């Protein structure tokens, strides 16, 4: 049982999704830009990811720029509420599996929390080899 908060316009998110599929399961796909998690769910995700709230903020997007979020003037809860009100601020992809939750940046972080091994070699879209045919992480 796997969930990915996916952005089809994200190379990182595309590579993650294909690595999930290459382990043999089709995840539930949540298009977070349109269907962001609830506040309770986002708080839980962040806790399980083991990263700070700020570390989840995506830079170089309109609300991060115009809300001045680069400056250290915001509590964690202020940032969480910005994320819910402006879901493009939530960096991507977040993946949930029975083993755990990770912000999969870079995409191959997902290999930590996938239960079943990659079924064959995996190469990212840009040709970066990630696992070879034997299953070794390059
Ligand atoms: Cs939701
Ligand atoms: Cs694993």
Swiss-Prot record:
For this chain, the annotated S-S bridges are none
- Species assigned in the record: Escherichia coli
Going by the entry's taxonomy, the superkingdom of the source organism is recorded as Bacteria
**Outcome, altering residue 126 to K:** 9-fold decrease in catalytic efficiency with arsenate. Mutant is relatively resistant to arsenate, but is more sensitive at higher concentrations
User: Outcome of mutating residue 92 to K, per the record?
Assistant: Loss of reductase activity. Mutant exhibits slight resistance to arsenate
Subunit comment for this entry?
Monomer in solution.
Determine if Calcium is one of this entry's keywords. no
Checking InterPro entries in the record gives: Arsenate_reductase, Arsenate_reductase-like, Thioredoxin-like_sf
Q: Where is the active site?
A: 10 (nucleophile)
- One Pfam family hit: ArsC
Q: Which family does it belong to?
A: Belongs to the ArsC family.
pH-dependence note: it reads: Optimum pH is 6.3-6.8.
Q: What is the name listed in the Swiss-Prot or TrEMBL entry for this protein?
A: Arsenate reductase
> Location of site Important for activity. Involved in arsenate binding and transition-state stabilization?
58, 92, 105
Its EC number(s): 1.20.4.1
Q: Which reaction does it catalyse?
A: [glutaredoxin]-dithiol + arsenate + glutathione + H(+) = glutathionyl-S-S-[glutaredoxin] + arsenite + H2O
Q: Which PROSITE patterns match?
A: ARSC
Keyword Transport listed? no
- Which PANTHER family does this one have? ARSENATE REDUCTASE, ARSENATE REDUCTASE-RELATED
- Mutating residue 104 to G/S: what's the consequence? Retains reductase activity. Mutant retains arsenate resistance
The record gives the effect of mutating residue 6 to S as: Mutant is sensitive to arsenate
Please provide the record's keywords in A-Z order: Arsenical resistance, Oxidoreductase, Plasmid
